[PDB]
C-alpha cells in the first residue's frame, strides 16, 4: 500500500532508515508502496528515532476512509 | 485514490483551496481519497498558485510502482 512519510528536524539515522524502503522525492518527503509488516517496522523506527522531530505517516487502506495516518512529535 | 499533498511557503489561498478536498493533518500536509478528476483540479491549483513555494503531490496508482508523484515550485 502507498505510504508517505513527512519528516521535520529528525536525526539523520531515521532519514537513512526511511530511505531503505521509501523514495525521498523532496528533502523530508518519502514515498513508497510497502507491505503492512514493513509499514509497522517504519512506524516503530519513527517512534524510536524521531527524538524531538515531527513526523507524519499516511498510508492507503481498504476502509471506507481509504487511508490512515499518524503524527509523531 | 489516496492523495497526499505537502506544501512549503505557498500562499494562504492555496492552503485554503486544498482544504476543500483534503484533510490538513499537520501544517502543510494534506491527505484524502479523491477521484482522478478532483486530483486534476488540485494539480491545476497547485501549479497555478505555488508561486515561490514548493509542493509535492503523491497518489496511489494501479501500477507496479504503486504510486506516482509530481513536484512543483521554486526548488524542484
Swiss-Prot record, chain A:
This is CRISPR-associated endoribonuclease Cas2. Induction: Repressed by H-NS. Activated by LeuO. Activated by the BaeSR two-component regulatory system, possibly due to envelope stress. Part of the casABCDE-ygbT-ygbF operon. Signal peptide: none annotated. Its EC number is 3.1.-.-. CRISPR (clustered regularly interspaced short palindromic repeat), is an adaptive immune system that provides protection against mobile genetic elements (viruses, transposable elements and conjugative plasmids). CRISPR clusters contain sequences complementary to antecedent mobile elements and target invading nucleic acids. CRISPR clusters are transcribed and processed into CRISPR RNA (crRNA). The Cas1-Cas2 complex is involved in CRISPR adaptation, the first stage of CRISPR immunity, being required for the addition/removal of CRISPR spacers at the leader end of the CRISPR locus. GO terms for biological process: CRISPR-cas system; defense response to virus; maintenance of CRISPR repeat elements. Keywords: Antiviral defense, DNA-binding, Endonuclease, Hydrolase, Nuclease. Belongs to the CRISPR-associated endoribonuclease Cas2 protein family. E.coli-subtype subfamily. Substrate DNA-binding induces large structural changes that generate a surface for DNA-binding across the Cas2 dimer and formation of an optimal catalytic site. Changing residue 8 to A/R: No effect on spacer acquisition, Cas1-Cas2 complex formation or CRISPR DNA-binding by complex. GO terms for molecular function: DNA binding; endonuclease activity. It comes from the Bacteria. Homodimer. Part of the Cas1-Cas2 complex. Forms a hexamer with 2 Cas1 dimers sandwiching a Cas2 dimer. The DNA lies across a flat surface extending from 1 Cas1 dimer, across the Cas2 dimer and contacting the other Cas1 dimer. Only 1 Cas1 protein from each dimer is catalytic, the other interacts with the Cas2 dimer and possibly target DNA. Disruption phenotype: Loss of plasmid silencing. The chain holds residues 2 to 74 of 94 of the full protein.
Amino acid at each position: 500500500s502507498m505510504l508517505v512519510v513527512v519528516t521535520e528536524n529528525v536525526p539523520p539515522r531515521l532519514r537513512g532508515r526511511l530511505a531503505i524502503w521509501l523514495l525521498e522525492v523532496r528533502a523530508g518527503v518519502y514515498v513508497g508502496d510497502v507491505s503492512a509488516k514493513i509499514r509497522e517496522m517504519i512506524w516503530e523506527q519513527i517512534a524510536g528515532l524521531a527524538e524531538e522531530g515531527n513526523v507524519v505517516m499516511a498510508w492507503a487502506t481498504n476502509t471506507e476512509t481509504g487511508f490512515e495516518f499518524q503524527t509523531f512529535g
